Amino acid sequence: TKFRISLGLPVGAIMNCADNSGARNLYIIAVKGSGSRLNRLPAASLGDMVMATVKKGKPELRKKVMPAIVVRQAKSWRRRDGVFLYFEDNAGVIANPKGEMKGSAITGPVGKECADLWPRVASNSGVVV
Amino acid sequence: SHRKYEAPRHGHLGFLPRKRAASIRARVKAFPKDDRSKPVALTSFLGYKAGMTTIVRDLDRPGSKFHKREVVEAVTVVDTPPVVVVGVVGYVETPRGLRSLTTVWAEHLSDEVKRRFYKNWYKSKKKAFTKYSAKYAQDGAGIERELARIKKYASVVRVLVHTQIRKTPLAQKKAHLAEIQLNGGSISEKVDWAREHFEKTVAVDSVFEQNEMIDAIAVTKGHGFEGVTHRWGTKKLPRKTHRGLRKVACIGAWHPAHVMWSVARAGQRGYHSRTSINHKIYRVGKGDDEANGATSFDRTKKTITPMGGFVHYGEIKNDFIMVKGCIPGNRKRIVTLRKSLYTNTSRKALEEVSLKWIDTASKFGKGRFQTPAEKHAFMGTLKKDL
Amino acid sequence: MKVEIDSFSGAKIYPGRGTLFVRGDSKIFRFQNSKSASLFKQRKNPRRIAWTVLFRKHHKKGI
RNA sequence: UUCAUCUAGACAGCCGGACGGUGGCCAUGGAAGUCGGAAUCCGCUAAGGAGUGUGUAACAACUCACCGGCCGAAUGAACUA
RNA sequence: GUGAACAGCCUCUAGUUGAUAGAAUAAUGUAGAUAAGGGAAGUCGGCAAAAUAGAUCCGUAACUUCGGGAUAAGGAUUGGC
RNA sequence: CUCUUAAGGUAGCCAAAUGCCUCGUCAUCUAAUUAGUGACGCGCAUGAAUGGAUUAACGAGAUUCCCACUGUCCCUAUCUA
RNA sequence: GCAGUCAAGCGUUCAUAGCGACAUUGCUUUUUGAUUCUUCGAUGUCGGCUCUUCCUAUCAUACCGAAGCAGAAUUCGGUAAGCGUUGGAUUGUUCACCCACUAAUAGGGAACGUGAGCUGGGUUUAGACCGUCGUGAGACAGGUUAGUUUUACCCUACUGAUGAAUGUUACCGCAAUAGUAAUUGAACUUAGUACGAGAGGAACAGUUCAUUCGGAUAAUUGGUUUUUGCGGCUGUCUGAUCAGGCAUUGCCGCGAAGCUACCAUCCGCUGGAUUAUGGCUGAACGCCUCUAAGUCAGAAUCCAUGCUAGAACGCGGUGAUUUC
Ligand SMILES: [K+]
Ligand SMILES: [K+]
Ligand SMILES: [K+]
Ligand SMILES: [Mg+2]
Ligand SMILES: [Mg+2]
Ligand SMILES: [Mg+2]
Ligand SMILES: [Mg+2]
Ligand SMILES: [Mg+2]
Ligand SMILES: [Mg+2]
Ligand SMILES: [Mg+2]
Ligand SMILES: [Mg+2]
Ligand SMILES: [Mg+2]
Ligand SMILES: [Mg+2]
Ligand SMILES: [Mg+2]
Ligand SMILES: [Mg+2]
Ligand SMILES: [Mg+2]
Ligand SMILES: [Mg+2]
Ligand SMILES: [Mg+2]
Ligand SMILES: [Mg+2]
Ligand SMILES: [Mg+2]
Ligand SMILES: [Mg+2]
Ligand SMILES: [Mg+2]
Ligand SMILES: [Mg+2]
Ligand SMILES: [Mg+2]
Ligand SMILES: [Mg+2]
Ligand SMILES: [Mg+2]
Ligand SMILES: [Mg+2]
Ligand SMILES: [Mg+2]
Ligand SMILES: [Mg+2]
Ligand SMILES: [Mg+2]
Ligand SMILES: [Mg+2]
Ligand SMILES: [Mg+2]
Ligand SMILES: [Mg+2]
Ligand SMILES: [Mg+2]
Ligand SMILES: [Mg+2]
Ligand SMILES: [Mg+2]
Ligand SMILES: [Mg+2]
Ligand SMILES: [Mg+2]
Ligand SMILES: [Mg+2]
Ligand SMILES: [Mg+2]
Ligand SMILES: [Mg+2]
Ligand SMILES: [Mg+2]
Ligand SMILES: [Mg+2]
Ligand SMILES: [Mg+2]
């Protein structure tokens, strides 16, 4: 349901939390659907669902693993229309395993691929790419 | 003990040895299966890799997220002036394989192909085929006898064609001569087609057509002696490694007490024969057609040559084949484009591609303008002129 | 196809050329090449960079 | 090797019957041949177990031991190496 | 001369121009560097490297043997005319 | 209440560079911790100038976490001598 | 450690769907013992990293048989090692344990593979501290900290690279033999359908993508900069200017070319024969029977197609073959 996007967020990357859930960053610990290769870090791209923790934010959100969705990448990737594009930062939003957002609003733009992949992210989104 | 962690091995054991190809022209090792109901046609063509550019086209792929949308794609341009037919080879089948029974050459051979038979052309007396051309003395009885032998035998017929390098911007001046299998029925009329086409040119538009999947057979760019890290893609050893890290650490267990053929070693990288299949022809452009680089949407009366020329190649003046993607080999290299060996029906084949635009900005830099006219229009009057 | 405009230099951008940058405030910036992209990241002023169309317009070059 | 069946018709095969006392005694919430214990009877009998299985909650209903119709010369079982 | 400076860097006087050379520019090295996005996930371990750095001004915590800690931390400025 | 010693380990301190069991138990630190820290203590086998406990400052000592930083790594590439 | 045979029992009924007591037969040498045959004029002694290959007692993937298989999920088993089998926290660790992704995170061997491949955290010299023990010197499968990892230019093997000889020389070919490669998932749809009271809930055909791998390639994007290409800057030197030297590439921005990145793009074939298995006809054995004769379909298997090399003692076709 999405073309390949240059991975820019390996495991251990900390992106900003773009939702209003009370988290200020998301710390990647896994990427959904990621493959296996010896020594290769699982890495996320725009629109990927990751497993992440909240490093700073409201205490109720910290110290636990939760799904997140990457809404901004900041690592340049190429759309099929030939456009190499990147955001100012890496950002994601907390979600449940089924893709529904924990928060109710996104701050800043959202990648179009992520908006198409996740309708709840799209519905809660403002500007899209 | 066991590996303790599984990884796929580095490199493909079916592309061994990683040695220099025996020739700069990669051999066609298989021709398409003959369908003897079709007319007589070449199964391949010879060209010269000019370089890459980029195109824009509307994708036609129902169910794709980019269906009826615009996609930017990379394409390779192969300069393909028509090839001159200069001979025909008859192949009889034997319990020891195919075997050439005889080759019949045309009466007159150009200096381009004659140079191929000479290491030192400038100081030779150019005697090549001088006694053979006398076989056409009065009636060509010997020539017709050899063609009759080919008809009476030679289950497989191939023509000998050579390129016209004089029509390319290459400095080589020595033509490339290759056998191209004739597909189409009636080995008799295979021979008749070859004889009638002796000394005559065959254009790439009579061999290949738009949207057609083709294979590219070329010797890859050479890179000389290479260490395992880039030759095979093995993991770089840690920074702490004494005696270097661009190596394979264990090149073998104690037993077998031999380095095995499958271990990555340092050696020559590149200059290998490769046959890559399923490259779609995006254009069959003609050299005499100004607006070669134009489409039904662009209409800028421009050729396919980028501003300033194809880097390290020159200007495209001949018929050219634009294939999607990339093909083995570097610019100026002879490439053999052959028809596909099977009938691909995958909806990636069978797609009718219509180009919307062809980039002709300079590849010698961050090219900004498609044409000198557009450059003048943007820049206004400069001090030198314009 | 549509030709875009370099946000810094005013140059015409053809499909696939240069890069696109989405700022945090959702503004779009198109760069025809790494030179204009690098000057923008360095926060140079196109009105001060002498080869840009913005500089040429502010200085009435060409007109 | 041993024990059996067999022109008074064997084995296999196909087809017909497979009953009555009787829902035999006990129990069971219910148990009728068939979840169990015990008793293994009698008549009609060419023949039929107080029941070989399937089946029901119990029924029912199929099925087999058992005896017959057809065929016609051999056949079955347990062992030994 | 710069500069706080016998620092580093350049120069004057004086001295030397001595290290086997020539041609190429593969791998692997030794030495020096850079690197998108991520940022220790590498590794026994941040090993190595990077980052910081001068001066002026502001600001400076716990603790303390009251002497320190302290350049704590953390910021701002710097050219030329 | 016993047996018992020269005296029976006091003040302190601890799974400590001293604790076998043991990766002790609880808490904290993390997504996850045989690590670190704080506690607990019938402590194999802690303990008082064989110095006990603690300590500002200092340390090319051992160790854990955090910020910064980065080719340590993802995953390698390139350049120079 | 793994696997059988029997079958009292478990499995509501029911020995053998799945298990299975009392016994009993084996296999393996990735356990640890036992032994002391080899090595004490020396086979470098843990683990990890790297890399190749092998085994199958198969975790996943392919095709299947069985079920206490309605679907879904799962379990048992067959052919199967073709293909993959991961990222991390703690620990030197092997092992372990947890987090997490995944189709799955199977077990092993190769001198407990692999130190002139690395590393050196541990162990296992000499320094030092502690606890217990010892009168003591000192001991400690007890703890702790510090502690030089040498040599290849030879032979072979391997990787690439030349090459005498076949009248010479040149071009075009053939193909023996050797290698071989693709992999796995998701989503849409089928279909909220089959199935199921319900909850739930497939599959084949079709489509778009993706994972792992591989082979190229440099149009684009990014990286790289002695293009010392342009510009800027510091310090000094050339009387000033212009233009330059030096600062071991002085530094900074941009930077073409080249090289190069799942950091970029493209490409990765279709036939036959089979295994398991399910069948046909059909006796043996008047019936039955996939099997005995014969025969059909059929797996990620095999062999071909295709792809790489081209035997330097395999071969063919063809051109020209020296006036002196
Ligand atoms: K010894
Ligand atoms: K470049
Ligand atoms: K200067
Ligand atoms: Mg690793
Ligand atoms: Mg393994
Ligand atoms: Mg590559
Ligand atoms: Mg070392
Ligand atoms: Mg270019
Ligand atoms: Mg660039
Ligand atoms: Mg009953
Ligand atoms: Mg001064
Ligand atoms: Mg970086
Ligand atoms: Mg960066
Ligand atoms: Mg950071
Ligand atoms: Mg770590
Ligand atoms: Mg690790
Ligand atoms: Mg550790
Ligand atoms: Mg250091
Ligand atoms: Mg300070
Ligand atoms: Mg302090
Ligand atoms: Mg006490
Ligand atoms: Mg204690
Ligand atoms: Mg403690
Ligand atoms: Mg830690
Ligand atoms: Mg005392
Ligand atoms: Mg003591
Ligand atoms: Mg000191
Ligand atoms: Mg030795
Ligand atoms: Mg040895
Ligand atoms: Mg097996
Ligand atoms: Mg070993
Ligand atoms: Mg060794
Ligand atoms: Mg060693
Ligand atoms: Mg070792
Ligand atoms: Mg050590
Ligand atoms: Mg010692
Ligand atoms: Mg003592
Ligand atoms: Mg000892
Ligand atoms: Mg530079
Ligand atoms: Mg000088
Ligand atoms: Mg200079
Ligand atoms: Mg049948
Ligand atoms: Mg048979
Ligand atoms: Mg040969």
From Swiss-Prot, chain A:
Residues spanning the signal sequence: none
InterPro entries, per the entry: Ribosomal_uL14, Ribosomal_uL14_CS, Ribosomal_uL14_sf
Superkingdom per UniProt: Eukaryota
Modified residues (N6,N6-dimethyllysine): 98, 102
The record's account of how the chain is modified after translation: Methylated by RKM1 at 2 different sites, but it is unclear which are the 2 methylated residues among Lys-32, Lys-98 and/or Lys-102.
Keyword Magnesium: no
SMART domains: Ribosomal_L14
Cell location: Cytoplasm
Keywords from the named record: Acetylation, Cytoplasm, Methylation, Ribonucleoprotein, Ribosomal protein
Gene3D superfamilies: Ribosomal protein L14
GO biological processes: cytoplasmic translation
MF annotations from Gene Ontology: large ribosomal subunit rRNA binding; structural constituent of ribosome
Cellular component terms per the entry's GO annotation: cytosol; cytosolic large ribosomal subunit
Function in brief: Component of the ribosome, a large ribonucleoprotein complex responsible for the synthesis of proteins in the cell. The small ribosomal subunit (SSU) binds messenger RNAs (mRNAs) and translates the encoded message by selecting cognate aminoacyl-transfer RNA (tRNA) molecules. The large subunit (LSU) contains the ribosomal catalytic site termed the peptidyl transferase center (PTC), which catalyzes the formation of peptide bonds, thereby polymerizing the amino acids delivered by tRNAs into a polypeptide chain.
Subunit structure: Component of the large ribosomal subunit (LSU). Mature yeast ribosomes consist of a small (40S) and a large (60S) subunit. The 40S small subunit contains 1 molecule of ribosomal RNA (18S rRNA) and 33 different proteins (encoded by 57 genes). The large 60S subunit contains 3 rRNA molecules (25S, 5.8S and 5S rRNA) and 46 different proteins (encoded by 81 genes).
More details: There are 2 genes for uL14 in yeast.
Family: Belongs to the universal ribosomal protein uL14 family.
Protein name from the UniProt record: Large ribosomal subunit protein uL14A
Record lineage: Eukaryota, Fungi, Dikarya, Ascomycota, Saccharomycotina
Gene behind this protein: RPL23A
From Swiss-Prot, chain B:
Stored InterPro entries: L3_arc_euk, Ribosomal_L3_dom_3_arc_sf, Ribosomal_uL3, Ribosomal_uL3_CS, Transl_B-barrel_sf
GO CC, any one term: cytoplasm
Residues in coiled coil: none
GO MF entries: RNA binding; structural constituent of ribosome
Protein location: Cytoplasm
Cross-link annotation Glycyl lysine isopeptide (Lys-Gly) (interchain with G-Cter in ubiquitin), location: 38, 135
UniProt PTM comment: Methylation at His-242 by HPM1 is required for proper 60S subunit assembly and promotes translational elongation fidelity.
Modified residues (Pros-methylhistidine): 242
Pfam families linked to this entry: Ribosomal_L3
Top-rank taxon, per record: Eukaryota
An annotated GO BP: cytoplasmic translation
Modification Phosphoserine occurs at: 23, 155, 296
Coarse class of the protein's main subcellular location: cytoplasm
Disrupted-gene phenotype: A mutant confers resistance to trichodermin, a trichotecene toxin produced by plant-pathogenic fungi.
Positions carrying Phosphothreonine: 102
Alphabetic keyword roster: Cytoplasm, Isopeptide bond, Methylation, Phosphoprotein, Ribonucleoprotein, Ribosomal protein, Ubl conjugation
Function: Component of the ribosome, a large ribonucleoprotein complex responsible for the synthesis of proteins in the cell. The small ribosomal subunit (SSU) binds messenger RNAs (mRNAs) and translates the encoded message by selecting cognate aminoacyl-transfer RNA (tRNA) molecules. The large subunit (LSU) contains the ribosomal catalytic site termed the peptidyl transferase center (PTC), which catalyzes the formation of peptide bonds, thereby polymerizing the amino acids delivered by tRNAs into a polypeptide chain.
Family under the similarity heading: Belongs to the universal ribosomal protein uL3 family.
Note: Present with 450 molecules/cell in log phase SD medium.
UniProt-recorded name of the protein: Large ribosomal subunit protein uL3
Provenance organism: Saccharomyces cerevisiae (strain ATCC 204508 / S288c)
Curated annotation (Swiss-Prot), chain C:
Residue numbers bearing the Phosphoserine modification: 7
Places the protein is found: Cytoplasm
Signal sequence annotation: none
Family that this chain belongs to: Belongs to the eukaryotic ribosomal protein eL24 family.
Subunit field text: Component of the large ribosomal subunit (LSU). Mature yeast ribosomes consist of a small (40S) and a large (60S) subunit. The 40S small subunit contains 1 molecule of ribosomal RNA (18S rRNA) and 33 different proteins (encoded by 57 genes). The large 60S subunit contains 3 rRNA molecules (25S, 5.8S and 5S rRNA) and 46 different proteins (encoded by 81 genes).
Misc remark: Present with 247000 molecules/cell in log phase SD medium. There are 2 genes for eL24 in yeast.
Function: Component of the ribosome, a large ribonucleoprotein complex responsible for the synthesis of proteins in the cell. The small ribosomal subunit (SSU) binds messenger RNAs (mRNAs) and translates the encoded message by selecting cognate aminoacyl-transfer RNA (tRNA) molecules. The large subunit (LSU) contains the ribosomal catalytic site termed the peptidyl transferase center (PTC), which catalyzes the formation of peptide bonds, thereby polymerizing the amino acids delivered by tRNAs into a polypeptide chain.
Protein name per its UniProtKB record: Large ribosomal subunit protein eL24A
Portion of the full sequence shown: 1 to 63 of 155
